[PDB]
């Protein structure tokens, strides 16, 4: 391949050739199979509003045109409804044929934290232009849970690519023949469509979770230390297979489809556009090569954050909620310790 996504080996090579820089050595687990986690620096800037830097504008200038400074050396609480800009430890000097995009880590979405990566001269968020040299910034606004963050916190990730080696319908339908993309012959390719499972799981019929209010603060570095029942309310199928989505709430829900991303492909979750005005999958993110790897079954369900917009919506089982889009890897991932993806 001469077009596709950079695997971890390449991301590591980029760091070794100073095309990607950081304030410190990377975390051992910082480079994912087809993306890199980004870490917060030592200062957060509390802002009145989010902004677009614009053409020929450094992010630092707009900042200086506005503003409370928060030190993250130990840990700061970011409150819901509040907007913070954070210089990231990682910076770039990209090859002119290489671009990148950013998405929240999936655990970021489970805590309902709004984030945007910004570049100098930015006209769009979460997009790094081909050949970009400069710093990176994370805009952070917690929506449901107040959070604690510090120097090193990882809320976001960046995927690097040469060109845009997306698969079209035919390529996707053939990969499902060769490998298994959905554990079901055969999927609705359009990429592959994801629908909502509202029938229930287990003996009690658990469908998912709704976020709670006035919780304790969530430490984003120690997320497994927090009891489930004092942040999330479990939701159980009781009547018909359907759920009223209250627009002020956030819901952690699950796809009906068990999905697989083969090791020479990465994926990205996208909103189902025909219905963006009704409800949306929030915090759509990157899927790594090897997701839902064949085990004795193939494929994992996707966990989805769904919110309704403006008006309450009765979401029904089997409703299509997103589209998993596939893209070629440049090479096969080498894995966490460089000794294989498994």
């Amino acid at each position: 391949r001469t077009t596709g996504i950079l695997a971890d080996g390449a991301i590591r090579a980029l760091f070794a050739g100073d095309k990607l820089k950081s304030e410190a050595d990377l975390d051992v687990d910082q480079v994912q199979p087809a993306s890199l986690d980004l870490r917060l620096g030592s200062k957060a800037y509390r802002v009145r509003a989010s902004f677009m830097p614009g053409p020929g504008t450094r992010v630092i200038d707009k900042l200086n045109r506005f503003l409370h400074e928060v030190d993250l050396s130990q840990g700061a609480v970011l409150e819901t409804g509040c907007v913070y800009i954070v210089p990231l430890m990682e910076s770039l000097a990209l090859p002119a044929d290489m671009s990148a995009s950013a998405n929240p880590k999936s655990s970021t979405g489970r805590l309902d934290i709004f984030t945007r990566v910004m570049t100098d001269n930015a006209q769009e968020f979460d997009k790094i232009p081909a050949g970009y040299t400069g710093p990176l910034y994370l805009e952070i606004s917690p929506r449901t849970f107040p959070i604690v963050v510090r120097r090193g916190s990882r809320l976001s990730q960046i995927r690097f690519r040469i060109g845009h080696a997306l698969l079209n319908e035919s390529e996707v339908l053939k990969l499902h023949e060769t490998e298994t993309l959905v554990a079901s012959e055969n999927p609705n390719v359009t990429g592959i469509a994801l629908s909502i499972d509202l029938k229930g799981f287990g003996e009690n019929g658990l469908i998912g979770y709704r976020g709670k209010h006035h919780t304790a603060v969530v430490d984003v570095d120690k997320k497994a230390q927090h009891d489930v029942l004092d942040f999330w309310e479990p939701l159980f199928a009781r009547g018909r297979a359907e759920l009223i989505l209250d627009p002020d709430e956030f819901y952690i829900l699950v796809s009906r489809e068990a999905v697989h991303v083969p090791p020479l492909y990465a994926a990205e979750m996208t909103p189902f556009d025909p219905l963006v005005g009704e409800f949306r999958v929030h915090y759509a993110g990157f899927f790594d090569p090897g997701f839902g790897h064949a085990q004795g079954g193939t494929g994992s369900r996707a966990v989805l954050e769904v919110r309704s917009h403006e008006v309450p919506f009765i979401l029904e089982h089997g409703q299509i909620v997103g589209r998993l889009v596939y893209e070629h890897m440049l090479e096969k991932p080498e894995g966490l310790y460089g000794t294989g993806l498994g």
């Binding site: 655990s107 799981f201 287990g202 658990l206 699950v254």
Partner: peptide, 9 residues
């Protein structure tokens, strides 16, 4: 029971 922080399910 999946937990809200579940990875693969």
């Amino acid at each position: 029971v999946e937990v809200p922080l579940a990875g693969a399910v």
